[model samples]
Target: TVDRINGITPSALDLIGNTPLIALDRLWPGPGRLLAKCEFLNPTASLKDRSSYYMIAKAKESGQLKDGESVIEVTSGNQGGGIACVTAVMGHPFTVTMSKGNSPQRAIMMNALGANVILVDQVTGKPGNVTADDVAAAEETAMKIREETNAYYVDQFNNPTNCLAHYETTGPEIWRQTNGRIDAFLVGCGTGGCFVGTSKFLKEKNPNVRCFVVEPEDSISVSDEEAIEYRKLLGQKEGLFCGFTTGGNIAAAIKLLKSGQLPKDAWVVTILCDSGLKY
Candidate 1:
């Protein structure tokens, strides 16, 4: 029994999920109980770890990735960090293309994790506001790299495994943590993996579960400043120091609840996707 209990915990890969679900009732006094998924606690301190882990694992199983084949991806920041961390443990060379607009902190983290970081200059945007065009530009550069070499391109957008990661892990975790009491789910849109995948599972479990998508500019038009302020509030009020998107998710969640889109007593949940330090 001692030997079994003293067994080594192998890799950071094994530390990916099972993040805690914390109530944000202090932030929102009424309406639904705002539950935040502390996904920033993952090994890479971002939810993208789940997607990177699954994407690479399935790629290997399907023979899309061979031993020693360098892995490459296009990302704003978090996904790059995720891939960098995952590939480091697996002994695969990793490269990534990202918008120059994204925070330098991400580049530093990826490089420190032994990933070759490529910054695309053509993408026009600032940090916390990376546009789709920037992602497209980075994608083109990544594609060129993939075409020239034997690198396994982890096209997160197109990868079903990305969504499958959340479907299999995040969604189920939320259901279990909430004890199946989650009435509504909301998240800021990025790859749509967390939003769509988790929403799918919850809706399947209970078709009446409400799902909402909050985009940076998408209708609610939550500005970067607003996101930053909300993020600060999260730190001050709830001691949850998460990224801007996390704040945006909360801001949108609160707005919807106040506007009567989400019922007062509904158990609304959102994701704290990554840590504030990443920004």
Candidate 2:
């Protein structure tokens, strides 16, 4: 059973992860089941909480971060809030490179948590204009910050610790919840943490279980140049500013779904961090 918070507790910081996974009978078609991990339940209303918490803890344990040492990272929104929250709790200075089309709610939350949010040009223009060059530029700026300030950059995109947290917690919890009877899993691949980590552990528990990934229409991780060409053919425009996935390569997981290569009774699972309503 899940516990409800009636009022302010002794430590609000204590409430972060351990979110609930709910079965989504409406989203999937046919016998393949679907489950959605409700990550918005986190204190900051996003799964970046897991990655940020792990990053901060690892930094503290390694003696790489200390009192007065600033933390830096580049994020579209959720990660900025995550870094902000972690630093707010630990009393460290934090800075974030925000994209132009970044979530306003997350930016506000990051500010509330005492993080310096720096807005950069959105490589993908708002709503439909995003370019690959925008993404590369954003990454370049983040790398520059790392080199110039000697700040601890919570590079969630390439960070192994983020996935490690899922391996240690999310995967085990699902196994126990399903009583080892899960047939298939579906999830989004933003930073690839949820897919990589949870799939690893779940497959170990039951190799028969299939894992599927879902993503946005223009995600950069899809690795399909032809898809981008198709989008262009359909008159799909790119954003002037770049955000997380850039909408071009976002179909990696959806393409997998179209491949039709899974168990007959497989299940599908995905994680929803937040909605545009809050952003």
Candidate 3:
């Protein structure tokens, strides 16, 4: 039997996935033990690398991307850096569109990976400033370039393939690592890949496994308080939460027990990455 997998090296690209899961029994406040999948161990210090690699691979497989073609995407966070790293390794050009709200360190990471960074003004309207509009505008420009120069546009926001990446890799690893004893999974929704992909796989393995989504409380897209108030205003008892970020989501997580969302026999887990602190 082979002692190790072939084509593996100490390169950052080689270190993109297969992160370790650590038991958090001491941190758990309930009967079930918590185990955190440490995705921050990946290169560039985020889980976005998996999605980025999958997106680029799909582009090449579909003949939409040829060797040395320009790869483009819009991201205000880790995804941009992930895409840049992938493209750099494959000898392709990369361009990223980002908002002013994005941290300077993220831009530096993208540039270090050899990506052309495009900055846009933040959007103004609605409940607060929404960066989605600015991201969309950047994506539109990338699409225009694709039309003009035959470059590939790797769109993570609405891509189902991106979700499949985590399903195929992350979900099964956790199930195997925990010896089929995992009772719950927790993840943040940046691109919705971790929640959608892993939840689908974990539920398929053990239909009773619980899934919890974490997001920033002040995020512009989906705020827990606003979601609850909106549901109340609509007189709806069964409320649905989307995979989006908001500030209230952070606050809700902190006061989860008070909100009566934390279950007695369930495990609660969350992830914090270097990107967030860098931002």
Top-TM-score structure, candidate number = 1
* Candidate maximizing lDDT: 1
Writing each residue's lDDT as its tens digit, candidate 1 over 1-279 gives: 112235765788877877889999888888668898899999878999999999998999999898878999887568888998889998899988988877777688889889999988855677667788988898899999999997999888889999999889889999999999987888877788988889899998988888888778523457787788889889999988998899898887777667776556888888999998886
Candidate 2: Cα lDDT at 121: 81
Order of the predicted models by TM-score, top scorer first: 1, 3, 2
Error of 2 at 16 (Å): 2.3
Each candidate: what lDDT? 0.85, 0.64, 0.66
**Model 3 weakest 10-residue run by lDDT:** 237-246
User: In model 1, what is the error at residue 136, expressed in angstroms?
Assistant: 5.2
* lDDT (Cα, tens digit) per residue for candidate 2, span 22-125: 65443335465545456666677777787888888888888988777889887765777777887888888998875665446547778888888776787656
Assess the local accuracy of residue 32 in candidate 2 as a C-alpha lDDT between 0 and 100.
57
CA RMSD (A), model 1: 3.4
Error of 3 at 5 (Å): 11
lDDT of 2: 0.64
Residue 145 error, candidate 3, Å: 2.5
lDDT of 1: 0.85
Q: Is candidate 1 or candidate 3 better by lDDT?
A: 1
